Structure formats: C-alpha cells, structure tokens
Structure 1
Amino acid sequence: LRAYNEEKELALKQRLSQLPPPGKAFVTAKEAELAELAEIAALYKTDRVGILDILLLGNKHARLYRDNTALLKDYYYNGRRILDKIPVKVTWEIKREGAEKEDWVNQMYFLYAPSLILLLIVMVYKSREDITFWAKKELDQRVLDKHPEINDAPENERDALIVERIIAGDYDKLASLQKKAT
C-alpha cells in the first residue's frame, strides 16, 4: 500500500489557511463556509497515505502531513462536538446512527480480545493435566501392579475392587522416603 501525494498536500495546507482556527471555526452557532469546513474536515477520515511511504520517504513530507492531519482532526472533532453533525455526506449530516469507529477498536477487538479468549481456552485445557488426576491414576496403577488378578475381573467389578484395595492398605510411599526417621 502506497498512497502519499506531496502535490495534494502542499495545496491542502493553503486550503486550510483560509479557515479560522478550529477553536473559533464554528462559534457562530455562512452555510457555504460551513460546507467547506464539512469537506475539509471530511478529509480526516479519507486516509491519505499507507505504509510504503511512511517507511520510505523523508521527514519534511512527514512533518507537513502531520501538521495537516493535526488541523484536520481539530476541525472534524470540533464540528462534530458543536454542531452534533458528522462531517460527511459533503455538508454536515446528522446521521450519527452507525459509521462511527474509534481508533482503538480494531486493536482491542481483533488482537486483545482474541488473545484473552485464547488464554481462557488454554487454561481450561491445561487444567486437565492437574496433579489430582495424575495421583488418582498413580494410586490405581500402584494397586493394579500389586494385585494384578483384579485385572481378570470384569470392568464393572474392577473399580469397586480397586477402591476396596485402596481402603484396606496404605499404598503411599511417604514413610519410605523418610529413611532417617527409623
């Protein structure tokens, strides 16, 4: 994506130059000047350059475009704040319903929020490898290794028999590890 134009920019500056400062540019509330304010402010949401030129070009063009965008943003937002009208459609239409994206939405909804969803999914499935399940299986395997005949028993009897063996006998190894306590 490349979208810059120095030719357009150096003239946009003068098209700004005729206008009053954006602080005082709407304090009348004629309609012709307000219409030009509408068009020039509408330029704020018409994106003027992409990546291939911010990366490649030089800082004089950058400083000029930066300045232009500063005054455009001031005009757009001041008209929107005083008149209650969006500066599109091009003379200051009222149609506020929709078509209003803030500059944080894309990041927070397509990077931050999916990241949080992925974190929740990862926690849910990471909780499956929890020590409580490992120790359940390990107790069962110790019992099955000491008393293999309950393997021969059918499925539905088997679990009751493992439970019986667990209840009767102390299959942990904690005291074994405590060698020096005699």
Structure 2
Amino acid sequence: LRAYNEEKELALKQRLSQLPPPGKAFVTAKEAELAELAEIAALYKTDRVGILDILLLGNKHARLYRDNTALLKDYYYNGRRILDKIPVKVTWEIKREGAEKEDWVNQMYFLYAPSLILLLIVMVYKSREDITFWAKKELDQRVLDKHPEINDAPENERDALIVERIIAGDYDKLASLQKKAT
C-alpha cells in the first residue's frame, strides 16, 4: 500500500491557509465557506498514505503531512462539535446514525478482547491438570497396585471396592518419607 503524493499536499496546505483557525472557524453559529470547510474536513477520513511511503520517504514530507493532518483533525472535530453535523456527504449532513469508528476500537476489539478470550480458554483447560485429579488417579493406582484382585471385579463394583480399601487403610507414603522420625 502506497498512497502519498507530494503534489497534493503542497496544494492542500494553502487550501487550508485561506481558512480561519479551526477554533474560530465555526463560531458564526456563509454556507459557501461552511461548504468548503465541510469538504476539507472530510479529507481527514479520506486516508491518503499507506505503509510503503512512511517507511521509505524523507522527513520534510513527514512534517508537512503531519501539520496538514493536524489542521484537518481540528477542522473536522471542531465542526462536528460546534455544529452537531458530520463532515461527510460534501456539505455537513446530520446523518449521525452509524458510520462512526473511533481509532481505539480496531486495536482493542481485534487484539485485546481475543486475548482475554484466549486467556479464559487456557485457564479453563489448564485447570484440568489439577493436583486433585492427579491425586485421585494416584490413590486409585496405589490401591490397584497393592491389591490387584479388584481388577477382576466388574466396573460398577470396582469403585466401591477401591473406596472400601481407602477407608480401611492408610495407602499414603508420608510417614515413609519421614524416616528420621523413627
């Protein structure tokens, strides 16, 4: 994507020069000058350069474009605030229902929200390798290891048998780890 054109900025600059400052540019509230303010402010949302030129070109074009965009920003938002009118469509219409995108929404909505969704998913699924499940499996395996005949019993009788054996005996190894105690 390359869209810069130095011919257009060197023209846009004096097209701006004719206009009063954006602070005082609408304080009248004739319609002709307000119309030109409408089109020039509309230029703000008409994106005019992509990535291939910001990477490649020199900084004089940079400063000029930066000043141009600053003044376009001011005209657009000052009109939009002191007129209750959008600078699109080109003379100042009221059609505020939709066609409004703030700059933060793309980054946040398309990166941050997916990231939190991913975090929730990862936590839910990392919750499965919990020590409680590991210890239930280990206790079951210890019972089966010491006492493999309940491996012959049918499925529904098994679990009751393991529970019986767990209740009766201390299948843990903790005291075995505490050798200096005795």
TM-score range, shorter chain: over 0.9
How big is the shift at 1:46? Answer: 0.2
How big is the shift at 1:58? Answer: 0.4
Give me the TM-score of the superposition, normalised by structure 1. 1.00
How big is the shift at 1:33? Answer: 0.1
What is the distance in 1 between the residues matched to 2:160 and 2:66? 76
SS of 1:24's partner is: coil
What is the distance in 2 between the residues matched to 1:142 and 1:3? 71
How big is the shift at 1:149? Answer: 0.3
How big is the shift at 1:108? Answer: 0.5
% identical equivalent positions: 100
Deviations 1:93-134 (A, max 9, x none): 000000000000000000000000000000000000000000
What is the distance in 2 between the residues matched to 1:179 and 1:147? 25
Deviation >6 Å, runs of 4+: none
What is the distance in 2 between the residues matched to 1:87 and 1:44? 9
What is the distance in 2 between the residues matched to 1:159 and 1:179? 32
What is the distance in 2 between the residues matched to 1:86 and 1:76? 8
What is the distance in 2 between the residues matched to 1:160 and 1:179? 33
How big is the shift at 1:141? Answer: 0.2
What is the distance in 2 between the residues matched to 1:5 and 1:89? 24
SS of 2:158's partner is: helix
How big is the shift at 1:155? Answer: 0.3
SS of 1:128's partner is: coil
How big is the shift at 1:37? Answer: 0.2
Aligned-pair Cα RMSD in Å: 0.3
SS of 1:129's partner is: coil
Deviations 1:37-93 (A, max 9, x none): 000000000001000000000000000000000000000000000000000010000
How big is the shift at 1:34? Answer: 0.1
What is the distance in 1 between the residues matched to 2:19 and 2:45? 19
Give me the TM-score of the superposition, normalised by structure 2. 1.00
How big is the shift at 1:20? Answer: 0.2
Give the gaps of 5 or more residues in structure 2: none
Match of 2:37 in 1: 37
SS of 2:128's partner is: helix
How big is the shift at 1:17? Answer: 0.2
Q: Report the number of matched residues.
A: 182
How big is the shift at 1:152? Answer: 0.2
Give the gaps of 5 or more residues in structure 1: none
How big is the shift at 1:171? Answer: 0.5
